[PDB]
Paper text:
A viral PARP-1-interacting protein (vPIP) encoded by murine gammaherpesvirus 68 (MHV-68) orf49 facilitates lytic replication by disrupting interactions between PARP-1 and RTA. As a molecular mechanism for the promotion of viral lytic replication by vPIP, it has been proposed that vPIP interacts with and sequesters PARP-1, thus disrupting the interaction of PARP-1 with RTA and reducing the amount of PARylated RTA. The results elucidate the novel molecular mechanisms by which oncogenic gammaherpesviruses overcome repression by PARP-1 using vPIPs.
The structure consists of 12 α-helices with characteristic N-terminal β-strands (Nβ) and forms a V-shaped-twist dimer in the asymmetric unit. The salt bridges are Arg65A–Glu266B and Lys162A–Asp265B (the protomer is shown as a subscript). MHV-68 ORF49 directly interacted with PARP-1 in solution without any other cellular factors; this action was found to be conserved in ORF49KSHV, thereby prompting us to propose a new name for MHV-68 ORF49: viral PARP-1-interacting protein (vPIP). Furthermore, a recombinant virus harboring alanine substitutions of these three residues showed severely atten­uated viral replication both in vitro and in vivo, suggesting that the interaction of vPIP with PARP-1 is essential for the ability to facilitate viral replication. The vPIP homologs of MHV-68 and KSHV share low sequence similarity (∼20%), with an r.m.s. deviation of 2.2 Å from PyMOL and a Z score of 24.5 from the DALI server, but they have highly similar structural configurations of multiple helices, despite the introduction of unexpected mutations in the ORF49KSHV structure.
Author numbering:
A (entry chain A): 3 to 174, 177 to 230, 238 to 280
B (entry chain B): 3 to 174, 177 to 230, 237 to 280
The structure:
Amino acid sequence: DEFYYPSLESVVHTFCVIDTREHNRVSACLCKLQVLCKICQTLRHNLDTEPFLLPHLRELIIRHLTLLERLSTTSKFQRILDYMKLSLEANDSNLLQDLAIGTVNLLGCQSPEILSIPYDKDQPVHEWCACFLTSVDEEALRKISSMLDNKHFSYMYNFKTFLKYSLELETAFDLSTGLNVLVYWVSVFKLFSVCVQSQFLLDSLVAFNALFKNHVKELEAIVESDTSVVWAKLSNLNHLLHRLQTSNNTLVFDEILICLRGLQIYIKC
Amino acid sequence: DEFYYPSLESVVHTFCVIDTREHNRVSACLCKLQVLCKICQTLRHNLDTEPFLLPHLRELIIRHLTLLERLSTTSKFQRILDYMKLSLEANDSNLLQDLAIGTVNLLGCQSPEILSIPYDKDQPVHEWCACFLTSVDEEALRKISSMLDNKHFSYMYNFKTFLKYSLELETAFDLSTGLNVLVYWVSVFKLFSVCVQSQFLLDSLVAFNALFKNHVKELEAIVESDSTSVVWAKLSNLNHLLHRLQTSNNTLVFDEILICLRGLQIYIKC
């Protein structure tokens, strides 16, 4: 269950756990520094991929719709699918609203009673998803809720993780599970659309880069409380951290990781 | 550990392994595909980075040189350090030779016997690393040359890996080992230089992309020679993905394909 970005709260909690369990304050700082190196590296990956995420998700719903075509029985049904599919190809300002009306209209065909629940423009995603999902056990709903109710975006699960749960929605290729998957992926698309327009990933990355600097500093000040190896390695870290403001790239993160491993091993003995 | 790219030869081995292990021809195809999906995905991650790789590696060496200046007993040693550093900054046509003669010469300061040792530019890089490493055990030599001797670029290790074995070399921090390390990074730099000059990662990405796309076609045939059939659906999906992959060769697509191959395994096992 990888994250697109983890919340600050999760990280502060992780740091506390580390503070409570490493004795050596220099170790502890170094653990936190690994943890932060990983995160900023993943987050850099995720940001470099970001400009492709919503195009990709558009095309994914289209495929899924394209698979739904095989289960069509009515000409209304297929016309809803065509509207949805085609919409997903262009930039209508109301794409996201139409994707949800669209999804409920499909659901209407197979079950007409559902159609006179009133469409709430501003109803939260996870609440829509919960509403229109059918025949899903309460453990799945929970997981889905933990993913879709992400505390006003304090975190965001990643694409691969949402794929993993879509596969668990599939357990015998009938229409209902078909429309379940559509609900899920439209939800997920709504959520990523907000998360990408607001640029939450950029924000998170800035914050955690800050946090990452603040611990390199914190590590110097800690070691300055005990001209050999440490001080070469610390100059490396410093140079690395330094270059990281020119070039936030994965290569730089790989050196920082091994540099950190560098110190941990030295300080063990 | 991890490869900048693997050899076809190794993958061909994993395949034959799979082929004899797996009950079904379908099952086998899918494993093969899962292996090829990871590999292609990793190789695209690597090729997006490659434009940054040589600049990074230079910048690393420059760093090691400044560090060695803390240990510059002599002013000759200093003058060479400066010369190597100016050379990495200029990134000239002569760089690699600048690096090699530099290194051999810093070494010569430590012990002059070293300077009578014959070598050339066409000599394989691992051979050169072996000569010029001082007192490292038959243990170190073995792994180094397995990294460095990559059998005429059949495979390449990635940077994370070369870093990893750098660490296991910073063992005793003297002039001596600070030169072993210089040597190793010069050697590594020369390998990646040739690798990037010669576009071996792109080559390997193209082959492995062919090899993945064509085994998807194989799987489709195979499956057929045996609407609400979730196989036929996943298969159709799989096909759309592969087709998109050829115009947007990107990590989100590989991720969708993986989940989809897993789906396909899960269903056929029944």
